[PDB]
Amino acid sequence: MKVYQTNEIKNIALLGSSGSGKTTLVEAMLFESGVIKRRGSVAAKNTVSDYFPVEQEYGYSVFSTVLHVEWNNKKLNIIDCPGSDDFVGSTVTALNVTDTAIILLNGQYGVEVGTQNHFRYTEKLNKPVIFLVNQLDNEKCDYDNILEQLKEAYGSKVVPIQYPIATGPGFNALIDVLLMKKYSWKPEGGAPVIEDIPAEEMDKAMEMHKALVEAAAENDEGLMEKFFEQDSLTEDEMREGIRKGLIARGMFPVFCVCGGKDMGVRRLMEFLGNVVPFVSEMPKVENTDGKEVAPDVNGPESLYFFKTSVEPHIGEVSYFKVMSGKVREGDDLLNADRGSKERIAQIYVVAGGNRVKVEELQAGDIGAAVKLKDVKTGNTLNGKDCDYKFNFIKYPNSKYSRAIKPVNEADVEKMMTILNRMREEDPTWVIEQSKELKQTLVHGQGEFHLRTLKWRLENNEKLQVKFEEPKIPYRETITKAARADYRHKKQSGGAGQFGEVHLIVEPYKEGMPVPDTYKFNGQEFKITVRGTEEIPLEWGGKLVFINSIVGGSIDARFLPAIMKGIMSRLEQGPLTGSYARDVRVIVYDGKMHPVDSNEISFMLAGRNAFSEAFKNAGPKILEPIYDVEVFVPSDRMGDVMGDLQGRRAMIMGMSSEKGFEKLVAKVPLKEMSSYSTALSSLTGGRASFIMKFASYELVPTDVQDKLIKDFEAKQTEE
């Protein structure tokens, strides 16, 4: 409730591999700061962070939780990312908002594949990294090995700050380097018995202290001058280097903490409030107009909303971060996107699932608000003097897609509303409503990511849903030139409705002009350029209606009747009932009755004539393909290439980058239906791929035959 200044706040986001001790460490930090009363164990299913229903039934974190700990004149805006693999949507969301990332390492395991994955996100976003070793009570541990495992993984910038005397359940003291003191503890935990380093470990402290002061010296030019003068920095002069070094991204500290037994948590909270990048020194964020927005406390107020947790039995809560300015209760704010004139009734400060009414949130601090009208994720709310509108968080591309569908076709509207709300909760649940496919597409990050969406629908809102294979957008085309003739006449009403049009059909490709000669069955037809028209279609492709009526043999105003007739049959498609594309149509000769021919006469004449041109020509089916850039380790490069060779892929590139590689391919979309599941199995969760549409190409005939037989099988049900 106590209003915190700009210099007294600081943003941290917890990262690390799954099952490393992030949620449990959060519980200890809140307990030692007095936010909660008694610790709740993850087995007891009463933790502060994992307060969601789905997040409890699994037993591990699903949604990152925003929460704070009050310490000595410093407030920490900790965000506890889930740390899994299929929930990286919330990891990038929290890592853009925050200003420093702490990576947790499991002592028993060491540097897992989850640790490697998250550290790549920090490199992408240029965020500080502090390595934090946890779970030191497991006997299957060796702190020397953990640094040894990590020393080659990342550069020599890594320097330790603490080391335990000995691991195992008997661990109750760890020798520090930053404060040159040994911190003993009791089995209950929470009571740091500060005590000067013993004689045996006195030898081990100096060289790392010499190493530690050396690491912080090079970070700042001024501190290097102090190194020459005094040859040693004791407490605070070397603390400034870590501030700049983390900004410089050239110093990764290593810690020790037992989150299970609350050993070092008080020391951990003291460190972060002591030396991390400030909200001011962190590289300023810029809005969509290029203005380098700075964390100015006195500037205009601007709310950025990034999380919209709608956890049941509490209500819709929309978290926000203030990029600049300050927020008083009962202020006036304008929605940058679709301005609804929102008035924040009362702001809140959030500590997991528990909120406390507060009267002010200075710039660069995370907050919360409840019961808003028209605020969605990504909407920026700001004052009337400035029209700031932020868009700087780019989520990773989709990696797995299924078409959701209710068990009964009566709750479709309800399922639309729920999915929209959950897309608001997690923006990575990309939903596209394709009219051509006539299906509700759900996009995520893997097979497991969409299963979590299913579970929330099944339990929280009591709606049954199922995931089905998504339809494929197929396009028709033709191979070789051909033609046909057709004539029409009907004398059941008034006029004869006479219509006869001879037209030539051939594929259209850019760069090749139309010839004036066509060899059809040992006969010659003359084509002249009377009209060059290329109408785009709403479903992609092109249509060319080159006309060659000889000087006015047929009426020169009756062409539009054929125009709508062709597209009527072009939309359907004879081979598979799908849209066609890239066809150049040549119309030259026809027979026209002087008075009995109207628009409907030629519309039917053109339509039926065009329909029969395909089966005399060569029809084909086009399969969309996606450019794929698989980031794969060198160890499993061979197995990944083989699988692509089973996907009818095309090897195009081979990039040797660090320990990993980078593979380029053009894999058909149908073969990419379930690749994220398959790629993880082959590699072991150490690879990622990116899809990118690259137009339609043809298919081998065996694929073509499979489609046509299935197409008629559905029609037989009538």
Ligand X SMILES: Nc1nc2c(ncn2[C@@H]2O[C@H](COP(=O)(O)OP(=O)(O)OP(=O)(O)O)[C@@H](O)[C@H]2O)c(=O)[nH]1
Residues annotated as binding site for Mg(2+)? 23, 61
DSSP string spanning 12-46? EEEEE-TTSSSHHHHHHHHHHTTSSSS---TTTT-
CB under 5 to 8 A by kind: which of Mg ion, ligand X, none does 20 bind?
ligand X
Q: Which is nearer to ligand X, 278 or 448 (CB)?
A: 448
Which amino acid is located at 659 in the chain? G
DSSP string spanning 218-271? TT-HHHHHHHHHHS---SSHHHHHHHHHHHHT--EEEEE-BTTTTBSHHHHHHH
Beta bridge partners of 434: 439
Q: Which is nearer to ligand X, 259 or 299 (CB)?
A: 259
Q: Which is nearer to ligand X, 7 or 138 (CB)?
A: 138
Task: Tell whether residue 138 is a contact of ligand X (CB under 6 A).
Answer: yes
Residue keyed to tokens 């398959």: 678
Q: State in angstroms the smallest separation of the CB of 5 from ligand X.
A: 31
SS3 211: helix
Pairing of strands 542-547, 583-591: parallel
Segment 65 to 84, residues that bind ligand X, using CB under 6 A? 82-84
Q: Which is nearer to ligand X, 260 or 624 (CB)?
A: 260
From 399, 400, 401, 402, select the one nearest 465 (Cα to Cα): 402
- Which residues are annotated binding-site positions? 19-24, 61, 135, 137-138, 258, 260
Among 10, 15, 21, 22, binds Mg ion (CB under 5 A): 22
CB under 5 to 8 A by kind: which of Mg ion, ligand X, none does 46 bind?
none
Pairing of strands 158-160, 75-80: unpaired
Q: What are phi and psi of 144, to 5 degrees?
A: -65, -40
Pairing of strands 430-434, 439-443: antiparallel
Q: State in angstroms the smallest separation of the CB of 663 from ligand X.
A: 28
Q: State in angstroms the smallest separation of the CB of 256 from ligand X.
A: 11
The whole-angstrom separation of Cα 603 and Cα 606 is 5
Helix, strand, coil percentages (3-state) for the chain, rounded to 5, are 25, 25, 45
Task: Tell whether residue 89 is a contact of ligand X (CB under 6 A).
Answer: no
From 489, 263, 279, 255, select the one nearest 363 (Cα to Cα): 279
Choices 18-26, 330-338, 431-439, 656-664; region in contact with Mg ion by CB under 5 A: 18-26
Is-contact 618 478, C-beta < 8 A? Answer: yes
Segment 61 to 80, residues that bind Mg ion, using CB under 5 A? 61
Q: Which is nearer to ligand X, 405 or 686 (CB)?
A: 686
Segment 34 to 63, residues that bind Mg ion, using CB under 5 A? 61
Q: State in angstroms the smallest separation of the CB of 263 from ligand X.
A: 8
* Residue span 669-698 as binding mask against ligand X, x where in contact by CB under 6 A, dash where not: ------------------------------
Task: Tell whether residue 60 is a contact of ligand X (CB under 6 A).
Answer: yes
Among 39, 48, 74, 83, binds Mg ion (CB under 5 A): 83
- Which residues are annotated binding-site positions for GTP? 19-24, 61, 135, 137-138, 258, 260
Instruction: Name the strand (E) or helix (H) holding 129.
Output: strand 129-134
Choices 82-90, 93-101, 234-242, 343-351; region in contact with Mg ion by CB under 5 A: 82-90
Q: Which is nearer to ligand X, 60 or 467 (CB)?
A: 60
SS3 143: helix
Pairing of strands 465-468, 439-443: unpaired
CA distances from 149 to 146, 158, 168, 174 (A): 5, 12, 19, 20
Strands (DSSP E) found in 363-509: 366-370, 380-382, 401-406, 430-434, 439-443, 465-468, 475-478, 482-488, 499-507
How many chain residues bind ligand X (CB under 6 A)?
19
Q: Which is nearer to ligand X, 50 or 220 (CB)?
A: 50
Q: Which is nearer to Mg ion, 23 or 683 (CB)?
A: 23
Task: Tell whether residue 40 is a contact of ligand X (CB under 6 A).
Answer: no
Cβ-closest position to ligand X: 260
Looking from the CA of 200 toward its CB, the CA atoms found within 13 Å total: 2
Among 135, 162, 172, 576, binds ligand X (CB under 6 A): 135
DSSP string spanning 484-547? EEEEE---SSSS---EEEEEEEEE--TT-PPPSEEE-SS-EEE---SB--EEE-TTS-EEEEEE
* Residue span 6-25 as binding mask against ligand X, x where in contact by CB under 6 A, dash where not: ------------xxxxxxx-
Q: Which is nearer to ligand X, 161 or 258 (CB)?
A: 258
Q: State in angstroms the smallest separation of the CB of 453 from ligand X.
A: 17
- Neighbouring residues of 311: CB distance < 8 A, sequence distance ≥ 6: 51, 52, 53, 317, 353
Q: Which is nearer to ligand X, 263 or 586 (CB)?
A: 263
Instruction: Name the strand (E) or helix (H) holding 599.
Output: helix 599-616
Segment 619 to 658, residues that bind Mg ion, using CB under 5 A? none
CB under 5 to 8 A by kind: which of ligand X, Mg ion, none does 42 bind?
ligand X
Q: Which is nearer to Mg ion, 14 or 587 (CB)?
A: 14
CA distances from 285 to 208, 289, 299 (A): 36, 11, 14
Q: State in angstroms the smallest separation of the CB of 312 from Mg ion.
A: 21
CA distances from 12 to 81, 89, 131, 442, 485 (A): 11, 17, 13, 31, 74
Q: Which is nearer to ligand X, 91 or 576 (CB)?
A: 91
Q: Which is nearer to Mg ion, 9 or 28 (CB)?
A: 28
- Write out the two tokens for 407: 């068990």
Q: State in angstroms the smallest separation of the CB of 82 from ligand X.
A: 5
* Residue span 233-262 as binding mask against ligand X, x where in contact by CB under 6 A, dash where not: -------------------------xxx--
Q: Which is nearer to ligand X, 272 or 580 (CB)?
A: 272
Task: Tell whether residue 172 is a contact of ligand X (CB under 6 A).
Answer: no
Q: State in angstroms the smallest separation of the CB of 63 from Mg ion.
A: 10
Q: State in angstroms the smallest separation of the CB of 22 from Mg ion.
A: 5
Dihedral sign (CA 435, 440, 441, 444)? positive
- Neighbouring residues of 413: CB distance < 8 A, sequence distance ≥ 6: none
Q: State in angstroms the smallest separation of the CB of 23 from Mg ion.
A: 5
The whole-angstrom separation of Cα 675 and Cα 445 is 11
CB under 5 to 8 A by kind: which of ligand X, Mg ion, none does 264 bind?
none
Task: Tell whether residue 377 is a contact of ligand X (CB under 6 A).
Answer: no
Task: Tell whether residue 154 is a contact of ligand X (CB under 6 A).
Answer: no
The whole-angstrom separation of Cα 471 and Cα 474 is 9
Which amino acid is located at 133 in the chain? V
Among 137, 365, 506, 661, binds ligand X (CB under 6 A): 137
Residues that bind ligand X (CB under 6 A): 18-24, 42, 60-61, 82-84, 135, 137-138, 258-260
Residues that bind Mg ion (CB under 5 A): 22-23, 61, 83
